């Protein structure tokens, strides 16, 4: 018995087009259909410079924007050998972590709105509209902040942003507590989530989950502890790791990972060195407006970096960061030219949404939206 | 194993005046009355809402909204036709054609940003050498018809003169970065 389970609530899971082969109410197999959001991203990037390539990444995962620009930047610094300053690293993490918070605040309470709890959605989205007052203030666009450029980061924080991020972090433990007091204790929540989509660790490894769905099963594997790719080796934070694997562990993790991300934000705030914002290598970082206008040699680079590009040397690397969805890695083959060459984007949600087939076997049809909830399936990456 | 796991996870809470605690917190729905109480606290608290048309959400001088071609204080469009923004544009929205005007100084005969084919990433504002193209904080230009949304060659992007009073302010405050 085949059922074309589509997007239950649009605007939350946009193009979800599962084709469930059911058995009464018990689902026997879930066959997701991809491509409804397949923009030509892995082709369009081959046609544009390494700078023009960056805006696609904030548009790859639309609920955790800067994590993908941070995964791309670290793939055009893996090749460029472009050492970025300490302040660029600290800002880059303070925003990758603000993005982890922006994602878990959505991927928890959009999940909690698919399950049925209507209010956590709107509380978490007031919180997200506080964090977009930081995105929009530091770069310009509330969602797609093309801000974490290859060398360092686009431009320094405004002169009042750390004070505001602090005044937000002080009041954010309470918001997590409310999102938690409203959902963690509920017997209507546990019942809707405990023993739902349980993934034994061998399955989370096999299906390349590598995210909050690889730390549910108990595999202690965070690419901020495994492969520290910034000040992360300096910052202190504990990676919460589940013990059962059910969608109630992944929720409890995403609601603790939203507190450890608060620890990382507070650290990045309390220790942010007053250094240069971009790599001093002005052939990888366009010089400031003031310098390119006054200096002829800076003007030449501002011209050959906003038209030509880097021309990062010939290589091929797989740089993977811990994006909120999971291990978002961008395999970036680079022909010597200024344009990338098959900038393949390993995006979790392409490996997670595979897991829907075995996660939601023998679960009731109303659980198939809870699974899609805890996978944090955002179809931009799929 | 799940059978033994159940037996043990239920033999953990197996001492009187603990079975009673759990029974009175699953019968007098007590986890749920802490949900209702929080929900009430938020029912009575002030509302984080904004009656939009009259007051609008906070922005920043770096905010990227409607593209505006700036002008030099003494008229003279700031847009010398280098085509750097036409080059840097990721979506290739800007189409620039250049002609030595009769005065002799280069200028763009055609400077058409296609707003629909535009990602509002501010690359044009960065790439332009003289700050000729900047994004005005407008962001309120929803058009009834698509053809209007294609911003014509240097005529509608020349409406930035109205927004110059705010664009000059944002630039005077952002240029420090």
């Amino acid at each position: 018995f085949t059922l074309n389970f589509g997007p239950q609530h649009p605007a939350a899971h946009g193009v979800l087009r599962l084709v469930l082969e059911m058995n009464g109410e018990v689902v026997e197999r879930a066959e997701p259909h991809i491509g409804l959001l397949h923009r030509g991203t892995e082709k369009l990037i081959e046609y544009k410079t390494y700078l023009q390539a960056l805006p696609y990444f904030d548009r790859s995962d639309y609920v955790s924007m800067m994590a993908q620009e941070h995964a791309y930047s670290l793939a055009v610094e893996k090749l460029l050998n472009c050492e970025v300053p300490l302040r660029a690293q600290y800002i880059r993490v303070l925003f990758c972590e603000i993005t982890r918070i922006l994602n878990h605040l959505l991927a928890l309470t959009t999940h909690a709105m698919d399950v049925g709890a209507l209010t956590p959605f709107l509380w978490a989205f007031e919180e997200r509209e506080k964090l977009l007052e930081f995105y929009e203030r530091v770069s310009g666009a509330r969602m797609h902040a093309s801000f974490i450029r290859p060398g360092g980061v686009a431009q320094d924080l405004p002169l009042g942003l750390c004070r505001d991020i602090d005044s937000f972090t002080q009041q954010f433990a309470s918001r997590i507590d409310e999102l938690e007091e409203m959902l963690t204790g509920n017997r209507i929540w546990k019942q809707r989530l405990v023993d739902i989509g349980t993934v034994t660790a061998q399955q989370a490894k096999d299906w390349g989950f590598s995210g909050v769905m690889l730390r549910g099963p108990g595999v202690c594997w965070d690419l901020r502890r495994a492969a520290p790719y910034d000040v992360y080796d300096q910052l202190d934070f504990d990676v919460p790791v589940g013990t059962r694997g059910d969608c109630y562990d992944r929720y409890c993790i995403r609601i603790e990972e939203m507190r450890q991300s608060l620890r990382i934000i507070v650290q990045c705030l309390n220790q942010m060195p007053s250094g240069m914002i971009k790599a001093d290598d002005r052939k990888l970082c366009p010089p400031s407006r003031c310098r390119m206008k006054l200096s002829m040699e800076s003007s030449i680079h501002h011209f050959e970096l906003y038209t030509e590009g880097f021309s990062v040397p010939a290589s091929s690397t797989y740089t993977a960061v811990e994006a909120p969805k999971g291990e978002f890695g961008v395999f970036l083959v680079s022909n010597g030219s200024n344009r990338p060459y098959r900038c393949k984007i390993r995006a979790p949600g392409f490996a997670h949404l595979q897991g829907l087939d075995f996660m939601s076997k023998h679960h009731m049809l109303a659980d198939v939206v809870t699974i899609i909830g805890t996978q944090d399936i955002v179809f931009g990456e799929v | 194993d799940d059978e033994e796991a159940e037996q043990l996870a239920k033999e953990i809470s197996k001492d009187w005046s603990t079975v009673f605690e759990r029974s009175m917190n699953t019968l007098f729905l007590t986890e749920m009355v802490r949900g209702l109480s929080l929900t009430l606290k938020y029912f009575f608290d002030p509302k984080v809402t904004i009656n939009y048309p009259f007051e609008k959400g906070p922005l920043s001088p770096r905010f990227r909204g409607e593209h505006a071609l700036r002008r030099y204080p003494t008229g003279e469009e700031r847009c010398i036709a280098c085509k750097l923004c036409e080059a840097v544009c990721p979506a290739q929205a800007i189409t620039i054609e250049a002609e030595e005007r009769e005065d002799g100084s280069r200028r763009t005969t055609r400077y058409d940003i296609d707003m629909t084919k535009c990602i509002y990433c501010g690359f044009c504002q960065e790439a332009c050498p003289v700050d000729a193209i900047v994004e005005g904080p407008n962001f309120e230009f929803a058009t009834e018809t698509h053809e209007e949304l294609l911003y014509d060659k240097e005529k509608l992007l020349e409406n930035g003169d109205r927004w110059e009073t705010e664009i000059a302010e944002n630039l005077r405050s952002e240029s420090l970065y």
């Binding site: 963690t184 405990v194 023993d195 202690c220 589940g242 013990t243 059962r244 409890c252 | -």
Partner: peptide
């Protein structure tokens, strides 16, 4: 249907961090 029902019993909540709390 003999499908495995979602048993809503489990072990009690105990926040499980990683071993790198104090000294890696």
């Amino acid at each position: 249907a003999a499908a495995a029902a979602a048993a809503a019993a489990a072990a009690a909540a105990a926040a499980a961090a990683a071993a790198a709390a104090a000294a890696a």
